[PDB]
Design a binder for this molecule. Sequence first.
Ligand SMILES: [Mg+2]
Ligand SMILES: [Mg+2]
Lengths: 132, 62, 65, 189
Amino acid sequence: GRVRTKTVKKAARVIIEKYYTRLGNDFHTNKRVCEEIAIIPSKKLRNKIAGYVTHLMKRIQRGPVRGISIKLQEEERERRDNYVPEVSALDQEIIEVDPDTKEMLKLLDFGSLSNLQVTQPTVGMNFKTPRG
Amino acid sequence: QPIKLARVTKVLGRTGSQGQCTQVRVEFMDDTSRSIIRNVKGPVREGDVLTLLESEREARRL
Amino acid sequence: PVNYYVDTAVRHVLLRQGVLGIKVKIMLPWDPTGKIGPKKPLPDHVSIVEPKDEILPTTPISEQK
Amino acid sequence: DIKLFGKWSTDDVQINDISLQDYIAVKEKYAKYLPHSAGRYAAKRFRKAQCPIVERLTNSMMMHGRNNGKKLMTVRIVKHAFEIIHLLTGENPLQVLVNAIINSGPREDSTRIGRAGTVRRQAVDVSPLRRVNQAIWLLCTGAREAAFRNIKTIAECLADELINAAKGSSNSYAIKKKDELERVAKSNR
RNA sequence: ACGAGACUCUGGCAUGCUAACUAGUUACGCGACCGGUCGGCGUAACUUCUUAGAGGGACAAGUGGCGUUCAGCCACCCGAGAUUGAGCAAUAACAGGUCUGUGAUGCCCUUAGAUGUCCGGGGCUGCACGCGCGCUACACUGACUGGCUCAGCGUGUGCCUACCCUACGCCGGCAGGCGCGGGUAACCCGUUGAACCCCAUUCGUGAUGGGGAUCGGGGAUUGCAAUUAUUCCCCAUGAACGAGGAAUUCCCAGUAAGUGCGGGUCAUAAGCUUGCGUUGAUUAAGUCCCUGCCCUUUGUACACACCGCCCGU
Ligand SMILES: [Mg+2]
Ligand SMILES: [Mg+2]
């Protein structure tokens, strides 16, 4: 069983969140970084922490991680999330509308809308799942 | 009935009172299109060949 | 760590009805050089140095000294 | 040019069983001078299939307490009876041993009932590795109790046992036990 | 937060560092035998081998699959190593063991023809029988007899305190005895010349040259006394036992098992125990079937808790 204990995992998470810039995908550089920025009284514990830091660096490389929260990374993440299409998906030349919502719009005083296309209603009143 | 071989395609699980049999899926060496489930007694792995003296029973699923 | 972080003593007390046994265990605080406690930290305790706040240089400035 | 002992080649040995080809190691990476290699084949599962078949036989010879760990004696007992198989048959002793392994391994046998049960037995198929293991065990046991309380030395009992198993004869203890197991599996089908 | 892990000791790797006449190795001289063999002699190099310090080294780290593509699992490369073995170990409990370890102990008992204390002699072993842990076997994969060749852990001269480990020489089948030295120990025993194993020999399938119980007669050693025979030696004697019924134990790799060796006990002494090497496997990489033990839901009229509670004549 190679399951890491909470000591290793919390230490690695804090180290990553604090020193994300200095870290990378290399175990042998990460362990030196950890031994420089932290006080780990054992070499085996240091190696375990560095190994989990390497694993988590690979994990953040292809997306986010529920434990880490890097302040600088969130800015770039929302920058990616700032995608804007050229044409708004809500700008449609013709939108289909049922007779009932057409009547509702007429009652709203918006019955002069031109983009509306009054589609035919359904025939069978079968919208319920059979019981049994 | 003749004796015919079958290659193991995937290890299904462990069965028996003491978990001594490996229930496995085997495809026939000649036909290559018909496959069955049999319990094999001993250490089994991917791709090894079991000689079936009887070759038409099916082991019970799970 | 039990061999240098906790100090233990066992004693007898002679009373009228017999002997009472007393055991005292003290867990010493971590003392860096000054004898109130052990110098070594607990092996499972990891301390992470707080990074100092730097300012990223916006433009390349060359300082001649 | 890696003949066993210093006399038995392997280039001519044909397994010709297909099923046990991957579990009898005799031919090119498993051609060694001696059936003694220390080796760590028990460390991980299935590795003993990489062990040469002659070394597996040698290891199986050290049995019944008084012979535990005496592997030099057993390599001597294999070197002899290879020298004797060659005299008796005129064929490569390695070929005789391989044929014996093929012939003496059961193909079916019975376990306790299927998924569960505590009354009868249910027939099942044998893994190739278990086939080879059981073949070696039966050949060694037959030799061992042929030599017990008899002027016939070991390395003579084992040679005749291997020869009979290669022939498929019913004079072999291993063949008798294999037939017994297979018949019981047949009855419990 | 405690426990688990972490931790400490220990096993493996380093031709990299530190450095050694209480460890060596190369080299060179001087010798002895036929360039070679010198645990023959001596002194430069140095640290591979030996010691023991510091540091390094492994993290599931790399690759490919399986997984919520997470936690992790499987396989493979590289690698000395991809799970070395121990030590310590929570809350809470047991009418578990120990008053026979104690100048640890409370209450009783006894205390001078003593349950205190010496001193003779017995006992603790006594043997129709039952039950545990074991040792040696039932042979030829072996006994015998010669020959050959490899360990490791370690312990050695004592407060009182008498009692150490032994090389070499001689005498004696032997067990032993007598002289001489070294060692308070990487200095001497010791280069620990272990056993199994290896090689050759004789036996020849039977209670046999297997096996060594029992028993007789001699000889030594330690002790103040050896008989109920301390131990050891010799020559005799030569039992059961031909692989063990129901029923059960311990075991997953340098492991089980064979095999010796040390420590303790020790005036005399290991079939015990605690350690150490040496030779070295078969099988498994799984499951709740047996045996337990955990949970979880459920029932209770229990709560001293099923060894409970409780009903009627
Ligand atoms: Mg169970
Ligand atoms: Mg009540």
